Write a sequence for this structure.
């Protein structure tokens, strides 16, 4: 059985039962919300292509020290920043 | 109040059993309008994770649910026809809602006609209450599992098949007939037979079952994809009860898993 | 007889078959509620010749028409939109103070065109002198002054 | 203001004299009531004069530099979201609102408004102790304008919807790293906690990566012996719980998610993955390597990679840095080779690939490098492009595996056709060619463009759809451009076939229809107004020639915004397409020869008129009242526009290739300069 | 509610699956909240109007707000003579056909809402798939500890689609700037000068000029460039959590992972059902090696 | 020693800017607690608490005085429960758990109210949620306003 | 609350004390030249609900000029 | 859904090209598939065919068409396994390792059925495990081993020489029923030719590479005269590193 | 509960009829009621 003390918890539920009339009860016609994959998409690029790919959108050498986003992590780097990596290595 | 419908409640589970072994589980208008109350009052209950509807049969009846009771319906249709008969008899006796030039005849004609229309109103009520009951089962907010043990006539077919969890035992059966009793089938199963799926898998089956009154069984209801669930276990209802006694929380994560595990271990045929 | 089965397909009237249409879900919920709704509407109104057609075909007691149409100005995404930039999204972004961002961007531009071509020759140099790399912008000092 | 409420105030037009002398035409519509203009259109209720005077007095300040008076401050200040200080949006704030608000704020406390504030202390209040009821909140806007006045929302079409949910179902496909997380990406845990750094967490992995992939001159090696527990996880009950919460964090961060090959979660109840390291062994015996990889590493043999790169590029061939990069990323960190590297390797290794391919039966996989399809992903070719057995392999693991193999030491120039251009450019622009080719593919896939080409060119040949289909496929590659003669009579044939039975060609090819709901007085605009064809309509952006799915939404919106409001510009206007001149027998476009190509302009015409009037169809076309406007318009450019529009919507790729060659001839020589300069760079660097 | 929350969870989950970004619970709920309030607005305005259902002939009339509320009932005295039962059924069926018309209207409205919602999701969704690093493999390709295995069959049947131009980036922003370039080019032309004096022209300027909106008038007063939230390039909720407390980090990443898994399971169920409907799949497992042999 | 705080999803810093303040400022009646409560993934008591704080922060920000009747309006059910409890057990304060009735309801106890709610209908949305739907009898109005001697 | 012609129009709901009976008024001028609000006499009987606390419908019923 | 889709079928995207007829024929084939699956579940014995590490839905690159390899896998080998199961139940050999069946049935005429089937089962297995689809380059250590034996004063002469000796051994087995192995005797390498129904484990060698010289292996592709071409291709597709780790495990 | 995949299919049972879950005739799309999360943080607490 349900204790008298705990019944308040049901209130919001019971509340939006009452309030579900009209548009809130309405679902978009045709659309279930479950969208299955159909095609296969890969936008990956060779490194030399993405070296200057985002220069106009952002600054040049956008992928510079990025290890995950480049196959060559050290390209585009100016000498100093290249030296930094070894500097912390030794 | 009629002891037509009976029930068994565990902590988190609910059993609604239709008891009418005499007329072969054929629901009256009152009994159906009652069932649509017990079903949604069991289903909208706070603690029910699963509400199981089945047939209570003491061994007198192998039906899960009958259709409309055709004896009742036939009876009062006949009465109505007879009253129209007498009313026409006296309408053409004086001719040799009906407005006349004689007060006595207007009196008795209108009494007769009014009573006739009341009878027809009872038949109509029967039909509407069965249809609305089906709808109730279809729209049940919390999970309503219909265990089908034994045969179903038309509106019974409807009642068992449209629950979102509809289980079939070996004994389950579907008879969509009634062009054999001189009427068109009822219970909405017509829809199931007309799905483009059925035309793909079994072209022609729809005409076969709708024209020829013919029984479909568990295997046929599974292949057509009318339901996902089937079991061979004795007294399943007890086990559902005792399983949902051992369950603990009401959070829908928990509920989803408990119900799902129940389904996978028994009602889906993995092994 | 075929014409009789042709007749079966016609929708239910109350003139022929004396029965109202079934529509099921509304009957399921609202069947017991109807007296309530009706008396909330102040009871029915019995009028005369509602659907009764006149001599030449005109409606007697002209029927009630629905005003309903889909409202076309109602997008909420432009009602409550981003507090400073006027964009219509629901996306919460913490921007930077305008004028912080301007100054910031300016000094970056200066610092980078200072490092990459220091001699103003115009071409990008990835091997900059130690003086151009660790060197402070004189524009900062000039701004203080 | 877009709205129902947004109509203006009462404004003067003069006495009867000035009114009759103002209006030329006047058309009346039925009487309806006067809505009072809203508060923001009302000049006396909205006057901002005080605030505008404040803006102007402070206006010279706005022209100077921004300078921090803390010198040495660089980083910008964050302004957070929803703070009242930063809200610039006034939805309904008129002078009226600002004044109601002002007054309420003033009677709240006056001491906020004083230049030198006096002591502000709360006193009693005259409404009662509950006075806040009659006081509180902010001034309220009238509810009529709240509800009704809002702009008309620009209708979203179904096209842009289908695009969005296409993008929605693209992202729901699996990424290869998530189900079983590579040991390489699970070393990356960093916490801000003081107990996390003392124990090097991923140390054995990181050590392995360093030792295998890095030169010993630069590598940092973590030792586990000196680490807190011996670089291990302690035995269970010993560590006071340090070890347990260590394990919890690790098992929680390293767990996989999503669906595996058996279609279920890694944590699913009854069914399991990687039983007894059954996948581990499956990698053991397979290994990740290309056939192409080892053919290359076989032919190259000992000699220097860089030397080879300076060789395989003569001076004008390609940037050495590019194919050096792509080569490195292909050999270790195994990737699909860029079509640059694939072209180079193709003309380098041709005899080894020939020898590898010379024995194979018919129905078995061969080895081929052909980039005719745009994309590089070697799940796309069937793995037959390189020698790869894998769809994808994560770089780190590949590098570790191949380094476990001991091989490397860690410790006429003028006239061109389109094909010539693409195969030349294939070396000097990877991306550009990759784009042209992807686009060509997608255009070849459309049924729509095909049906248009076919049904346009059928009447001219009148014959076999076999020849038309062939000419379609050849048109796709630039190997066919129609002769201007054929073009003109195709256009004519179109006007004829669309007029004789209107049903097919007004339901497929589109003309704009006249609105008799709208009537004004002009000679062009009246033939635009009643019972005529206004414009030749281009294909909707979904069925048209290819555009990428970045921009497809904005492209669509723009097309609709422009068609609806009758803007002629951008994607709606059709570019003038060239054809092959009458005297010239050449089949294609050429880079150098410009006189083979002929444009049909407004001013300079190709004899479209004289060919029309002298055609046998001239009178049956003159029959159509609707075409009468597109034949004869104030702008004699109706025929020119109909023409160019027709051949744009039917044969989009003529303009496509024309622009390709345009761009080539533009940018080629800068590219050769870059190539020679860089190659000679590594050349003198190398011999030195 | 459901159709929305499914798509939003799709977005959140995918956001963490493909890149290491987490969406703030704050954000996730505020999306949904915006959908909700949209519906609410449509309701506010829907109640100002009425829908009229009518039963037999015209002699039973029912006037009801589209939400299904009942305002008036007109009836012929003919009806008054029937029965209480039949009176009830008649009025009830009129009410039903009214609710029908109303519900048709509302469902168009809802389609409209769904479109606005999608349009609002688009900078996020197209934020995650429009990057130079994003990729997918076919769902039928085996996955092993190193990487993903190649699907063998029909080497023609696998086509890799690409959403990004491989040469220098053309972003949606450049397209909008192109659109206003063409707007100005059209306007400032002589033929455009004459067009701006037409009714079409002033309709265009009333709808799509924000710049001319008087101070204090509702709506945006500038034209906005399309939002750019590139997913791998913008740190969202994971960096704040990682700085503050590891525990909330682990919990939120756990939530995202769970949601993603759930979405994927849903997609598998729909796929299975669509496979069964067309008869390529049986109704119980007939192939157990596809499961037990891993 | 103060460094960690539970529930990191909603930070106090981020709730300083109140949500949609540019709307419910201008017609606070069209904005019942529901519309805003869909914004937070928390439980009922917490989100209403937060809404109160939003309103107050907003008010102090705009230099006007806040509605002090607002906490009573959002919590109205809790208000009246506390009033009637105070009259029942004789005490002044807020009722706590120990003093609740020990009645055990059946499982389906809520059915009547459930079908009453599920079948309700409203002319406009204001009628749907007005603040005063909690009150029917005169006793209700006498308990709800006992505080303001004005009302 | 809306504006036209220079003045306010407000919708309100008149009610008995027990809120048994009610009347809506759509557009009412807000005019502060009236010391006290005026209604048509006919409503006096419409709004009278005789509860327990007020045996006659109203607490105060008198005649003024 | 994987469990519900039958064994052969591929699960893909609907292109809506299906006329209702073939759409029904498909469902009928699926029903049949379910029936035959129910009977194969009960026909299942102790031993079973090995799961393939690489996708064979298309052929094995540079070596086999789809039909060739699937005539080895789904025709001859599965028959061998049915035989093996028929004759290892109801005998003292029930439920033991593949080894203890091969080794305890060695050299006896009475159990020749069991032994032949067993050894063929092993050979086919090891053959599948000896094929890496795009081939591989032989690892340094193995090359060093082979060179010390076969190599005469040439660079990886041992590779051309080993892939020669394998060819010669293959051509010198006339019956075209059997196997060719590169194996480790434990004191030296050699290329041995096993007749059908014989195995390297039975002779207590340690196998490195397997090549299938059955005529049924190369018939559909290379015809009856195509054995040389066949072997030459096999080396394009073979798996060396396996042979290497087996060699190194043998040594220690 | 969440870790064991089992029972997660049940959030989505509406998928069992394809032409329906598109049509939205039935208001119950979810396990406990109208949708999967109506009240996630409230309802379940009614169990002692
Ligand atoms: Mg009650």
């Amino acid at each position: 059985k349900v204790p008298h003390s705990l019944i308040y918890n049901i209130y919001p539920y019971l509340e939006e039962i009452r309030r579900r009339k009209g548009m809130m009860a309405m679902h978009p016609p045709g659309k279930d919300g479950l969208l299955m994959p159909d095609r296969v998409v890969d936008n990956r690029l060779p490194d030399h292509l993405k070296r200057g790919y985002y220069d106009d959108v952002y600054w040049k050498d956008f992928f510079a020290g990025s290890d995950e986003h480049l196959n060559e992590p050290r390209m585009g780097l100016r000498g100093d920043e290249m030296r930094r990596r070894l500097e912390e290595a030794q | 109040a009629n002891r037509t419908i009976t029930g068994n409640d565990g902590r988190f589970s609910k059993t609604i059993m239709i008891n009418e072994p005499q007329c072969n589980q054929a629901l009256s208008a009152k009994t159906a309008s009652e069932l649509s109350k017990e079903i949604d009052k069991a289903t909208n209950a706070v603690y029910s994770k699963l509400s199981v509807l089945e047939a209570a049969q003491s061994g007198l009846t192998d039906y899960f649910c009958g259709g409309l009771n055709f004896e009742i319906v036939g009876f009062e249709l006949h009465m109505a026809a007879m009253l129209r008969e007498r009313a026409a008899a006296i309408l053409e006796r004086s001719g040799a809602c009906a407005m006349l030039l004689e007060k006595a005849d207007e009196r008795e004609v209108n009494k007769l006609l009014r009573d006739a229309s009341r009878y027809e109103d009872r038949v109509d009520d029967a039909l509407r209450q069965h249809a609305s009951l089906i709808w109730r089962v279809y729209t049940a907010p919390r999970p309503l599992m219909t265990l089908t043990n034994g045969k179903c006539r038309g509106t019974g077919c409807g009642l068992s098949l449209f629950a979102k969890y509809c289980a079939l035992k070996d004994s389950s059966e579907f008879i969509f007939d009634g062009p054999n009793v001189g009427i068109t089938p009822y219970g909405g199963m017509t829809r199931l037979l007309a799905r483009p799926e059925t035309s793909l898998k079994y072209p022609g089956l729809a005409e076969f079952v709708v024209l020829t009154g013919a029984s479909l069984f568990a295997g046929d209801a599974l292949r057509l994809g009318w339901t996902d669930l089937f079991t061979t276990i004795p007294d399943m209802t007890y086990h559902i009860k005792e399983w949902f006694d051992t369950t603990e929380h009401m959070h829908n994560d928990a509920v989803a898993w408990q119900l799902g595990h129940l389904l996978e271990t028994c009602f889906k045929m993995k092994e | 007889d075929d014409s009789d089965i042709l007749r079966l397909r016609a929708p239910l009237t109350y003139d022929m078959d004396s029965t109202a249409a079934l529509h099921v879900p509304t009957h399921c919920g609202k069947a017991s509620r109807l007296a309530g709704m009706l008396q909330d509407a102040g009871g029915v109104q019995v009028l005369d010749g509602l659907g009764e057609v006149d001599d030449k075909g005109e409606p007697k007691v002209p029927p009630l028409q629905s005003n309903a149409s889909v409202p076309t100005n109602v997008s909420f995404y432009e009602m409550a939109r981003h507090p400073w930039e006027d964009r219509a999204s629901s996306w919460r972004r913490d921007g930077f103070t305008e004028g912080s961002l301007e100054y910031f961007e300016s000094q970056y531009r200066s610092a980078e065109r200072a490092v990459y071509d220091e001699e103003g020759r115009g071409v990008r140099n990835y091997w900059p002198s130690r003086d151009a790399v660790e060197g402070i912008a004189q524009e900062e000092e000039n701004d203080a002054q | 203001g877009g709205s129902v409420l947004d109509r203006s105030v009462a404004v003067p037009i003069g006495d009867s004299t000035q009114v009759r002398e103002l209006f030329v035409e006047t058309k009346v519509l039925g009487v309806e009531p006067l809505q009072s203009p809203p508060s923001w259109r009302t000049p006396f209720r909205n006057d901002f004069a005080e605030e505008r005077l404040k803006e102007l007095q402070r206006a010279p300040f706005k022209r100077e530099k921004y300078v921090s008076l803390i010198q040495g401050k660089y980083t910008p200040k964050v302004k957070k979201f929803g703070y009242t200080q930063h809200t610039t949006v006034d939805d309904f704030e008129t002078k009226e609102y600002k004044d109601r608000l002002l007054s309420k704020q003033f009677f709240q406390n006056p001491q906020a408004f004083e230049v030198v504030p006096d002591r502000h202390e709360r006193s009693v209040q005259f409404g009662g102790k509950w006075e806040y009821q009659r006081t509180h909140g902010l001034p309220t806007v009238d509810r009529n304008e709240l509800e009704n006045g809002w702009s008309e929302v620009e209708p979203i079409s179904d096209g842009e919807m289908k695009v969005i949910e296409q993008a929605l179902r693209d992202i729901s496909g699996p990424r290869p790293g998530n189900f079983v997380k590579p040991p390489s990406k699970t070393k990356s845990l960093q916490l801000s906690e003081s107990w996390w750094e003392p124990l090097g967490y991923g140390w054995e992995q990181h050590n392995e990566e360093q030792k295998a992939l890095c030169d010993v001159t630069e590598q940092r090696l973590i030792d586990g012996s000196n680490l807190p527990f011996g670089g291990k996880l302690p035995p269970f009950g010993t560590s006071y719980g340090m070890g347990e919460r260590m394990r919890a964090i690790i098992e929680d961060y390293s767990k996989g998610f999503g669906l595996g090959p058996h279609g279920h979660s890694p944590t699913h109840d009854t069914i399991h993955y990687n039983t007894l390291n059954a996948e581990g062994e499956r990698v053991r015996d397979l290994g990740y390597t290309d056939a192409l990889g080892r053919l290359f590493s076989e032919k190259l043999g000992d000699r220097d990679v860089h030397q080879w790169a300076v060789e395989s590029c003569a001076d004008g061939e390609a940037d050495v840095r590019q194919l050096l990069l792509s080569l490195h990323e292909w050999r270790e960190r195994g990737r699909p080779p860029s079509l640059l590297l694939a072209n180079v390797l193709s003309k380098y290794l041709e005899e080894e690939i020939a020898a590898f391919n010379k024995g194979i039966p018919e129905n078995a996989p061969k080895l081929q490098l052909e980039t005719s399809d745009g994309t590089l992903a070697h799940s796309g070719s069937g793995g037959s492009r390189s020698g790869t057995m894998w769809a994808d392999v994560d770089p780190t693991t590949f590098a570790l595996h191949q380094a476990s193999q001991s091989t490397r030491s860690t410790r006429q120039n003028e006239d061109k056709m389109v094909v010539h251009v693409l195969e030349e450019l294939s070396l000097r622009n990877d991306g550009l060619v990759m784009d042209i080719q992807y686009a060509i593919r997608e255009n070849k896939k459309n049924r729509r463009l095909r049906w248009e080409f076919v049904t346009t060119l059928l009447p001219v040949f009148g014959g076999n759809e076999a020849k038309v289909e062939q000419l379609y496929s050849d048109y796709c590659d630039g190997k066919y451009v129609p002769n201007i003669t054929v073009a003109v009579e195709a256009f004519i044939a179109f006007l004829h076939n669309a007029t004789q039975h209107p049903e097919t060609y007004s339901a497929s090819d589109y003309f704009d229809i006249d609105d008799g709901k709208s009537s004004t007085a002009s000679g062009t605009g009246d033939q635009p107004s009643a019972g005529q064809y206004t414009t030749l309509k281009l294909l909707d952006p979904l069925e048209g020639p290819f555009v990428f799915d970045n921009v497809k939404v904005e492209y669509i919106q723009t097309v609709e915004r422009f068609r609806r409001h009758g803007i002629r510009a951008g994607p709606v206007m059709a570019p003038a397409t060239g054809f092959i001149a009458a005297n010239c027998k050449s089949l294609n476009y050429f880079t150098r020869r410009q006189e083979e190509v002929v444009y049909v302009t407004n001013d300079s015409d190709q004899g479209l008129r004289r060919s029309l009037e002298n055609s046998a169809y001239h009178k049956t076309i003159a029959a159509n009242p609707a075409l009468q406007y597109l034949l004869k318009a104030r702008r004699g450019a109706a025929l020119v526009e109909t023409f160019n529009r027709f051949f744009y919507r039917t044969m989009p790729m003529l303009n496509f290739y024309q622009n390709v060659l345009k761009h080539y001839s533009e940018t080629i020589q800068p590219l050769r300069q870059a190539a020679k300069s860089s190659t000679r760079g590594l050349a003198r660097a190398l011999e030195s | 509610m459901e159709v929305y929350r499914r798509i939003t969870e799709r977005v959140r989950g995918a956001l963490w699956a493909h890149h290491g970004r987490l969406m703030s619970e704050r954000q996730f709920h505020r999306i949904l909240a915006f959908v909700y309030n949209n519906k609410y607005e449509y309701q506010i305005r829907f109640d100002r109007m009425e829908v009229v259902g009518r039963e037999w002939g015209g002699r039973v009339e029912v006037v009801t707000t589209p939400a299904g509320f009942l305002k008036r009932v007109r009836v012929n005295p003919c009806v008054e003579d029937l029965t209480l039962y039949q009176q009830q059924q008649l009025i009830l069926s009129a009410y039903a056909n009214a609710c029908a018309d109303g519900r048709k209207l509302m469902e168009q409205a809802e389609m409209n809402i769904y479109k606005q919602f999608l349009k609002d999701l688009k900078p996020i969704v197209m934020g995650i798939r429009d990057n130079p690093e994003f990729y997918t493999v076919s769902e039928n390709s085996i996955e092993t500890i190193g990487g993903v295995l190649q699907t063998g069959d029909s080497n023609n049947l696998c086509h890799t689609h690409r959403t990004i131009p491989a040469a220098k980036a053309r972003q949606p922003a450049d397209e909008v700037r192109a659109r206003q370039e063409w707007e100005q080019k059209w306007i400032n032309s002589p033929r455009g000068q004459s067009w701006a004096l037409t009714l079409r022209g002033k309709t265009y300027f009333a709808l799509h000029g924000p710049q001319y909106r008087p101070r204090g008038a509702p709506g945006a007063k500038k034209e906005t460039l399309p939002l750019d939230i590139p997913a791998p390039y913008t740190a969202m909720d994971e960096k704040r959590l990682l700085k503050k407390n590891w525990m909330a980090y682990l919990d939120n990443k756990h939530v995202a992972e769970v949601m993603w898994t759930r979405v994927k399971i849903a997609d598998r169920e729909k796929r299975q059902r669509l496979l069964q409907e067309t008869g390529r799949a049986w109704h119980r497992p007939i192939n157990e090696e596809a499961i037990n042999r891993w | 020693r103060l460094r960690y705080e539970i529930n990191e999803d909603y930070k106090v810093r981020d709730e300083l800017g109140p949500e949609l303040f540019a709307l419910w400022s201008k017609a606070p009646e069209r904005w019942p607690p529901e519309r805003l409560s869909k914004m937070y993934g928390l439980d009922f008591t917490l989100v209403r608490k937060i809404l109160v704080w939003h309103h107050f922060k907003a008010c102090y920000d705009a230099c006007v005085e806040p509605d002090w009747s607002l906490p009573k309006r959002l919590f109205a059910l809790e208000w009246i429960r506390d009033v009637r409890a105070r009259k029942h057990g004789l005490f002044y304060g807020k009722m706590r758990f120990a003093e609740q009735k020990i009645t055990f309801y059946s499982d389906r106890f809520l059915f009547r109210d459930l079908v009453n709610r599920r079948e309700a209908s409203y002319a406009n949305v204001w009628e749907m949620d007005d603040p005063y739907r909690f009150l029917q009898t005169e006793q209700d109005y006498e308990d709800y306003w006992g505080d303001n001697y004005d009302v | 609350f809306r504006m036209s012609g220079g003045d306010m129009f407000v919708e309100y709901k008149v009610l008995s004390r027990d809120h048994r009976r009610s009347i809506r008024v759509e557009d009412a001028i807000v005019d502060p030249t009236f010391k006290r609000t005026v209604l048509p006499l006919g409503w006096l009987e419409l709004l009278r609900s005789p509860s327990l606390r007020l045996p006659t419908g109203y607490f105060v019923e008198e005649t003024v000029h | 859904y994987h469990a519900y889709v039958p064994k052969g079928a591929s699960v893909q995207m609907g292109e809506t090209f299906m006329p209702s007829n073939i759409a029904t024929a498909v469902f009928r084939e699926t029903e049949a598939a379910a029936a035959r699956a129910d009977k194969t579940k009960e026909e299942t014995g102790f031993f079973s065919q090995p799961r393939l590490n690489y996708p064979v839905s298309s052929g094995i690159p540079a070596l086999f068409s789809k039909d060739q390899f699937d005539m080895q896998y789904s025709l001859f080998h599965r028959d061998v396994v049915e035989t093996l199961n028929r004759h290892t139940l109801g005998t003292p050999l029930e439920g033991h390792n593949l080894e203890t069946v091969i080794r305890k049935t060695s050299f006896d005429a009475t159990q020749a059925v069991a032994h032949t089937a067993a050894s063929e089962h092993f050979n086919y297995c090891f053959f599948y495990k000896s094929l890496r689809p795009w081939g591989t380059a032989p690892p340094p250590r193995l090359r060093e081993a082979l060179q010390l034996q076969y190599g005469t004063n040439g660079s990886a002469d041992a590779m051309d020489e080993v892939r020669r000796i394998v060819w010669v051994t293959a051509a010198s087995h006339q019956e075209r029923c059997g196997w060719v192995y590169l194996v480790w005797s434990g004191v030296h390498f050699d290329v041995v030719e096993f007749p059908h129904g014989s195995c390297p484990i039975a002779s207590d060698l340690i196998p490195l590479l397997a090549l299938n010289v059955h005529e049924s292996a190369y018939i559909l592709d290379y015809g009856t005269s195509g054995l040389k071409q066949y072997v030459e291709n096999y080396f394009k597709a073979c798996n060396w590193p396996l042979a290497e780790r087996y060699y190194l495990m043998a040594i220690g | 509960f969440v870790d064991l995949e089992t029972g997660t299919s049940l959030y989505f049972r509406d998928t069992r009829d394809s032409a329906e879950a598109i049509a939205h005739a039935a208001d119950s799309k979810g396990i406990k009621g109208m949708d999967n999360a109506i009240d996630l943080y409230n309802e379940y607490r009614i169990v002692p």
